[PDB]
Amino acid sequence: GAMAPSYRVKRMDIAKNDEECVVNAANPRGLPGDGVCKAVYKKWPESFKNSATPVGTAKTVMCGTYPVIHAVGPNFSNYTESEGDRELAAAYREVAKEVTRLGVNSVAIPLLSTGVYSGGKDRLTQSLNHLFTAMDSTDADVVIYCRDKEWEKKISEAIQMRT
Numbered sequence: 001g002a003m004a005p006s007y008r009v010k011r012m013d014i015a016k017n018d019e020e021c022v023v024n025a026a027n028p029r030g031l032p033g034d035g036v037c038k039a040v041y042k043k044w045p046e047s048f049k050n051s052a053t054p055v056g057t058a059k060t061v062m063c064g065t066y067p068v069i070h071a072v073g074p075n076f077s078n079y080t081e082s083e084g085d086r087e088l089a090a091a092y093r094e095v096a097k098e099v100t101r102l103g104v105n106s107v108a109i110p111l112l113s114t115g116v117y118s119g120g121k122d123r124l125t126q127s128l129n130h131l132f133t134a135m136d137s138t139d140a141d142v143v144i145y146c147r148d149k150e151w152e153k154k155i156s157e158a159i160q161m162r163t
């Protein structure tokens with residue numbers, strides 16, 4: 001465990017993270033994809049061997065000894081708001097199981113279903129709240145990665161609000 005488990009947020013490429021493992025915002029087919037997924041494919045391509053997994057699940061593959069947790073959020077273009085919300089919550093619960101099983105003291109995590117799977121809606125609060133619901137009972141240091149300056153400010157405020 002971390003001595004004083006924390007949440008932090010950084011605005012940078014998650015492929016440059018300083019944590020003991022990474023969560024990929026994966027597709028269900030284990031394809032290179034785009035955005036975070038493409039960055040993860042460039043940095044850790046070995047981790048895409050048999051990484052395909054269904055929506056709402058996470059599957060860990062090692063790149064050397066560095067764990068890549070492939071977490072598949074729903075594409076809100078295809079899911080109803082109700083079913084997508086249930087699958088997005090479930091993906092983060094499977095992330096928390098993997099982080100715990102791996103025994104890591106820190107994890108780098110993007111906001112699932114906020115980019116090309118958002119169905120064109122702002123899901124910062126929805127995705128971050130499901131992240132907190134899953135991760136709050138874990139003792140890993142969590143570092144959230146984002147790219148947008150306004151998102152950085154809103155995620156940082158949400159973390160500080162809980163103290």
Ligand SMILES: [Cl-]
Nearest residue numbers: 011012013016
């Ligand atoms: Cl960067």
Ligand SMILES: [Cl-]
Nearest residue numbers: 114115116117
């Ligand atoms: Cl996405």
Ligand SMILES: [Cl-]
Nearest residue numbers: 146147148151
């Ligand atoms: Cl972002």
